[PDB]
């Protein structure tokens, strides 16, 4: 029995859910059908590793997640989720990119498909990748949370300014 528990985020409520101390879910589920989480148990306090690691990373104190996952889904989808892993902060890939990683080229637009499916949403980084064209995609209000996440990431100032003295 999964258990959930939503926190604030700059990019709206955040929802997160699985057993235990591993993540199985991370969106921002509002305004629209996702009839999954009535399947679950609210929790306040579980997930709070990962709740202290989201808040420092949009503090833009956190650049790398040291969290639990399972990753469900098609054979195809997780290997395009572990290769988004990879992704460094701050960078991008093409989904032309992320197809000749996982061993597919050609199959781009498998990817983009795959990535609009990502159930873990920031610490697996979907928003990372980008098309040759530069355009967003995502649905609705998930193209301005992709752009939110896009600017933050590129905003960051450097960590040691003694590299300067």
Known sequence: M??????????????????????????????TYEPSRTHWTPDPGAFSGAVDQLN???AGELTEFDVELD??????????????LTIPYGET????????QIGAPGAARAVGLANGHNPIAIIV????????????????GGINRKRA?????????????????
């Not at 990019?11 to 305004?31: D, F």
């Not at 890939?93 to 000749?100: K, L």
């Not at 905003?155 to 003295?165: G, H, I, K, Q, V």
Request: aromatic letters at 10%; charged letters at 20%; hydrophobic letters at 40%.
């Open 93 to 100: 890939r093409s989904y032309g990119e992320i197809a000749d």
């Open 56 to 58: 420092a990373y949009f």
């Open 2 to 31: 999964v258990h959930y528990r939503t926190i604030d985020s700059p990019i709206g409520p955040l929802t997160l859910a699985g057993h235990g101390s591993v993540l199985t879910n991370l969106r921002m589920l509002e305004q």
């Open 125 to 140: 980084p979907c928003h990372r990748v980008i098309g040759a064209s530069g355009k967003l995609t995502g649905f609705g």
């Open 71 to 84: 990753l469900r889904g098609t054979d195809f989808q997780q290997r395009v989720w572990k290769a988004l």
């Open 149 to 165: 996440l896009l600017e933050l990431e590129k905003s960051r100032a450097p960590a040691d300014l003694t590299l300067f003295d």
